[PDB]
Amino acid sequence: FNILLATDSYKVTHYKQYPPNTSKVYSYFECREYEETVFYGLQYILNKYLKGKVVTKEKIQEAKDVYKEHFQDDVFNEKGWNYILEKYDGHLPIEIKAVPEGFVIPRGNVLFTVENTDPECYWLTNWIETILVQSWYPITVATNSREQKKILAKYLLETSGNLDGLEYKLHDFGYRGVSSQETAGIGASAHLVNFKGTDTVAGLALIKKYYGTKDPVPGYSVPAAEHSTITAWGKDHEKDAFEHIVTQFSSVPVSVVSDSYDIYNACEKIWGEDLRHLIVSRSTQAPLIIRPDSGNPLDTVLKVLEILGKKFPVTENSKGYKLLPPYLRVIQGDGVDINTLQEIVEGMKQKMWSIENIAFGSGGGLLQKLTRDLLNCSFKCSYVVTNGLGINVFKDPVADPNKRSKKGRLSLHRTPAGNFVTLEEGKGDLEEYGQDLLHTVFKNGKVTKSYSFDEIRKNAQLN
Amino acid sequence: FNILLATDSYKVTHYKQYPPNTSKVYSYFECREYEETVFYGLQYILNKYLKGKVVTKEKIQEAKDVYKEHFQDDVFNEKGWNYILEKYDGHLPIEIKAVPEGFVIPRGNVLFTVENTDPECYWLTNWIETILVQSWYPITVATNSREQKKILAKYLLETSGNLDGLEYKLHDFGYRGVSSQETAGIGASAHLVNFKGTDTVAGLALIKKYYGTKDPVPGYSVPAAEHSTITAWGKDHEKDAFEHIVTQFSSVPVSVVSDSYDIYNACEKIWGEDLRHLIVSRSTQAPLIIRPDSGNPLDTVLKVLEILGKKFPVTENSKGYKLLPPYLRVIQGDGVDINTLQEIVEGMKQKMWSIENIAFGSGGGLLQKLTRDLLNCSFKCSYVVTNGLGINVFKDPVADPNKRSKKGRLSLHRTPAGNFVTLEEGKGDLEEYGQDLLHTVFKNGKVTKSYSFDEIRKNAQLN
Numbered sequence: 001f002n003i004l005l006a007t008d009s010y011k012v013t014h015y016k017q018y019p020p021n022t023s024k025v026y027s028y029f030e031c032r033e034y035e036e037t038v039f040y041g042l043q044y045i046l047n048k049y050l051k052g053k054v055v056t057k058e059k060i061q062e063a064k065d066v067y068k069e070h071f072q073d074d075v076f077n078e079k080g081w082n083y084i085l086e087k088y089d090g091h092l093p094i095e096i097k098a099v100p101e102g103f104v105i106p107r108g109n110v111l112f113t114v115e116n117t118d119p120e121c122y123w124l125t126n127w128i129e130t131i132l133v134q135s136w137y138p139i140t141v142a143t144n145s146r147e148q149k150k151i152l153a154k155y156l157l158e159t160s161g162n163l164d165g166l167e168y169k170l171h172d173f174g175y176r177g178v179s180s181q182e183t184a185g186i187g188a189s190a191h192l193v194n195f196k197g198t199d200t201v202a203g204l205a206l207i208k209k210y211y212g213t214k215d216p217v218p219g220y221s222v223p224a225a226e227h228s229t230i231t232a233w234g235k236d237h238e239k240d241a242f243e244h245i246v247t248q249f250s251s252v253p254v255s256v257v258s259d260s261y262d263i264y265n266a267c268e269k270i271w272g273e274d275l276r277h278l279i280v281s282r283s284t285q286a287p288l289i290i291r292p293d294s295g296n297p298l299d300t301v302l303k304v305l306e307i308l309g310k311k312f313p314v315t316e317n318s319k320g321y322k323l324l325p326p327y328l329r330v331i332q333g334d335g336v337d338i339n340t341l342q343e344i345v346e347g348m349k350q351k352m353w354s355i356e357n358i359a360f361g362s363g364g365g366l367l368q369k370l371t372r373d374l375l376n377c378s379f380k381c382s383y384v385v386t387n388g389l390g391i392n393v394f395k396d397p398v399a400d401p402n403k404r405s406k407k408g409r410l411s412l413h414r415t416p417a418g419n420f421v422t423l424e425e426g427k428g429d430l431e432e433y434g435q436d437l438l439h440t441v442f443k444n445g446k447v448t449k450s451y452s453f454d455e456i457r458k459n460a461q462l463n
Numbered sequence: 464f465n466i467l468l469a470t471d472s473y474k475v476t477h478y479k480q481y482p483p484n485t486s487k488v489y490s491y492f493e494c495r496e497y498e499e500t501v502f503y504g505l506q507y508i509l510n511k512y513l514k515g516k517v518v519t520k521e522k523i524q525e526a527k528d529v530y531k532e533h534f535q536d537d538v539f540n541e542k543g544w545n546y547i548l549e550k551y552d553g554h555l556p557i558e559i560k561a562v563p564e565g566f567v568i569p570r571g572n573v574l575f576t577v578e579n580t581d582p583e584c585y586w587l588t589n590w591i592e593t594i595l596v597q598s599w600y601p602i603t604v605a606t607n608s609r610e611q612k613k614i615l616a617k618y619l620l621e622t623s624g625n626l627d628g629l630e631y632k633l634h635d636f637g638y639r640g641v642s643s644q645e646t647a648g649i650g651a652s653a654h655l656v657n658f659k660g661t662d663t664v665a666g667l668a669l670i671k672k673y674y675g676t677k678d679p680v681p682g683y684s685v686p687a688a689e690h691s692t693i694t695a696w697g698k699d700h701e702k703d704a705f706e707h708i709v710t711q712f713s714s715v716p717v718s719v720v721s722d723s724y725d726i727y728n729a730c731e732k733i734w735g736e737d738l739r740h741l742i743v744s745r746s747t748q749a750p751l752i753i754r755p756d757s758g759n760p761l762d763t764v765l766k767v768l769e770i771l772g773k774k775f776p777v778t779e780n781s782k783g784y785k786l787l788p789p790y791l792r793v794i795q796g797d798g799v800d801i802n803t804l805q806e807i808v809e810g811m812k813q814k815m816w817s818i819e820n821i822a823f824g825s826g827g828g829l830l831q832k833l834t835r836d837l838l839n840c841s842f843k844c845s846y847v848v849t850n851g852l853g854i855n856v857f858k859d860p861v862a863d864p865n866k867r868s869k870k871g872r873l874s875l876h877r878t879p880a881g882n883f884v885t886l887e888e889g890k891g892d893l894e895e896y897g898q899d900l901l902h903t904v905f906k907n908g909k910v911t912k913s914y915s916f917d918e919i920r921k922n923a924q925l926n
């Protein structure tokens with residue numbers, strides 16, 4: 001990895017565009033204008049890409065050679081990068097202040113600020129915008145995942161009277177559905193801020209290396225079938241496949257995809273009759289978890305539950321909702337996203353089925369179908385010092401008031417009512433709103449403040 | 464990187480689920496059911512993750528330890544992985560056959576197949592589904608990028624009479640808007656299959672390392688401003704910022720973001736009057752490229768062109784379309800995706816503006832706002848050998864006929880009319896449809912056939 005080659009191309013030319021005699025460039029990140037966001041992911045970026053000796057004579061030469069051909073011209077700031085190498089042993093003369101990871105902040109607040117600590121490096125602040133802005137991803141995954149948790153919590157509490165099993169109710173199936181191995185690890189880790197279930201193995205190692213947990217692992221899974229393991233037996237032998245699988249995993253929970261040919265026949269005739277004796281004998285710690293994977297998500301879930309309710313002994317819980325026996329559950333792992341999740345749980349509640357009967361799986365919808373514009377994540381310069389004088393800077397496009405950026409030196413504070421406010425124009429300097437909530441997390445090549453994954457989960461908890 | 468930890472968790476448990484006495488598992492990848500797709504990206508995956516010695520005693524131990532905690536149980540196939548280590552020096556006993564990269568194939572055709580070459584490794588075929596399926600990303604980016612090229616080609620030809628400059632008409636601005644550094648490189652490279660412009664520097668190194676080009680670099684950029692470089696001068700000095708920038712880059716093309724405060728005032732008064740003398744003197748090889756970045760994309764483009772057409776000498780080309788003088792162009796780099804692109808060029812054509820006047824920049828829309836379901840990318844087992852007998856395997860869910868998979872051994876062929884057809888059930892064995900277009904690209908830990916980036920671009924060319 002070469003930080004000199006990890007920026008948008010045009011930023012290579014910016015050192016020639018700032019006003020002459022500019023000694024400071026100060027910029028900030030916010031989720032402009034999903035009313036609250038979970039701040040998570042910066043620590044990974046700081047450690048993997050920004051800390052330590054990130055400049056070498058070799059990296060400078062490689063960048064110079066690439067840019068000469070890429071621009072068909074010499075515009076690369078060789079002198080500037082060499083200065084960092086010689087003066088700071090290749091450590092970035094930058095200071096980043098940020099809100100603690102896991103914190104849940106309303107939209108439109110400063111989440112982190114960046115500024116150069118050496119006047120010669122005024123151009124460096126915005127050079128690293130590209131890498132830092134990618135924090136939009138873990139923030140958005142974490143936020144969208146927590147919003148789904150809010151829905152599950154509401155419906156589980158209503159139908160059951162408690163939140164038992166909530167943290168296992170939305171499972172990450174997104175490994176194959178994301179754009180890369182790196183994305184998989186980052187995305188899965190962001191989901192784990194809220195839940196404990198993932199099949200995206202890459203997330204475990206990331207958390208362990210960059211954040212850390214008291215527990216051996218931050219996420220868990222259970223044995224489960226895929227279409228290949230059912231279909232390989234041949235169409236006429238779907239029952240043999242089911243029998244073999246539940247027998248192989250007789251003492252642990254096991255998820256079995258049941259829609260290979262006819263989900264309804266599988267539930268009613270195969271599980272419901274042919275193999276019923278192998279299901280009712282299972283332990284409460286080892287249920288069979290029936291998995292539909294096609295058709296309209298809500299219709300399928302309701303029909304599967306109706307079928308099962310007629311083949312197995314259902315009870316009515318203390319809230320009046322129907323509950324399958326403890327050795328039998330369902331997981332809907334197809335077509336689940338923040339929208340459909342809501343429709344499913346509401347539909348289940350209307351038909352009197354407890355949310356305790358089900359878990360949900362989501363892959364592309366959880367980790368891939370998200371963009372930087374969902375929370376309007378944006379990085380902008382709000383303050384500069386030129387000829388020794390500080391000036392408050394901002395953009396304010398005529399046609400889009402929503403794109404207006406904040407002015408001057410920023411700070412994040414608690415309001416008298418205990419809410420959040422971002423003070424602009426250095427106003428935090430007046431001591432009218434208590435201390436600034438942002439902490440220095442990076443300074444001159446070193447990570448100065450960090451959080452464990454356990455702390456982050458705690459900060460991200462639902463009310 | 465540890466391949467034993469680079470799969471969906473449940474796949475760890477599959478070796479106990481397949482029918483007993485299974486010696487072969489054969490699976491394929493297709494974009495089920497955007498009528499044609501560009502096959503690109505597999506070579507990157509093969510080289511980065513699958514080739515050579517990918518198993519070590521250490522990697523086996525690490526996986527065993529992770530899985531014990533992740534499943535809270537011992538289900539890991541230690542013996543199976545040890546066999547690969549001891550028998551093949553940790554090289555994967557797998558054969559992958561694929562259509563040549565860059566090929567444009569209609570939906571619903573086999574693109575690549577996977578199978579184990581050692582009966583003991585029947586479980587390995589699908590272990591690597593997760594990593595291989597991630598090829599959906601570069602395929603989708605390449606395809607979506609090419610579809611945008613088709614739109615630009617149609618409108619440029621109509622308004623100009625030729626395709627000059629088509630290869631630079633859609634520029635990649637997606638570095639910051641993607642989910643990770645790795646995604647950025649892969650995504651940018653996929654866009655470069657069709658175009659030559661990118662600010663996503665990560666793409667250059669990827670192409671150079673895994674594919675290769677005759678030219679020093681596969682992609683290019685030009686100097687350009689960002690809001691920070693304009694706003695840093697202070698609101699009242701937007702003109703000074705513009706003047707400094709065009710002067711610093713007087714002999715090369717330069718893109719200048721002009722919507723910081725009022726895009727219309729900037730075009731009419733600043734560029735159009737105050738600094739007009741610095742624009743009309745520019746070389747045809749170094750135009751000023753005005754960049755709006757906010758408001759309704761079509762309305763803004765039309766209004767900017769109308770303004771410019773009244774301040775600068777416009778000509779009418781041989782097709783009857785208006786053309787700005789050669790030292791002046793526009794780039795619309797906001798709100799551009801496959802849908803809006805079409806609306807913009809059609810709107811321009813209606814108002815008699817040549818497509819020669821404009822280039823488009825797309826970031827999140829080009830590289831992030833895409834999912835695996837856009838082209839229905841899916842990997843499924845279609846053939847197995849159990850007890851020495853081959854059987855054709857498939858799924859066919861009752862509620863969704865669209866999820867039906869192909870049966871048996873597959874091959875890709877040309878039809879007498881020159882189209883494509885996928886033969887099922889080993890029917891390719893009959894020699895009625897010429898040779899199989901799939902070629903062995905990976906076998907037993909070695910990449911057996913590779914393509915240069917130049918060959919790929921050639922294969923991906925528009926008709």
Ligand SMILES: CCNc1nc(-c2ccc(NC(=O)NCc3ccc(N)[n+]([C@@H]4O[C@H](COP(=O)(O)O)[C@@H](O)[C@H]4O)c3)c(F)c2)ccc1C(=O)NCCN1CCCCC1
Nearest residue numbers: 165168173177199221222224255285329358359363364471
């Ligand atoms: C109600 C059940 N409760 C629970 N369930 C689970 C649970 C259920 C199922 C799975 N696993 C699967 O089901 N594995 C299948 C699969 C895997 C990957 C993958 N990738 N896919 C495919 O990936 C594609 C991507 O889809 P895309 O297109 O991208 O959207 C999709 O198609 C998929 O087919 C499919 C799982 F791990 C966990 C866990 C805990 C509880 C719970 O409550 N515990 C606490 C209580 N407990 C305390 C202890 C004592 C007992 C009580």
Ligand SMILES: CCNc1nc(-c2ccc(NC(=O)NCc3ccc(N)[n+]([C@@H]4O[C@H](COP(=O)(O)O)[C@@H](O)[C@H]4O)c3)c(F)c2)ccc1C(=O)NCCN1CCCCC1
Nearest residue numbers: 008628631636640662684685687718748792821822826827
């Ligand atoms: C008509 C013009 N013709 C051409 N133009 C170009 C061209 C124009 C502009 C730029 N560069 C910018 O404009 N740089 C700005 C920017 C950069 C990155 C970035 N990241 N961003 C931001 O990234 C965010 C992500 O946005 P998101 O939210 O994710 O969507 C967005 O906001 C952006 O602000 C913004 C560029 F490189 C190239 C090239 C060739 C031709 C052409 O025709 N040559 C052949 C003919 N030629 C032959 C030779 C002789 C002369 C004639």
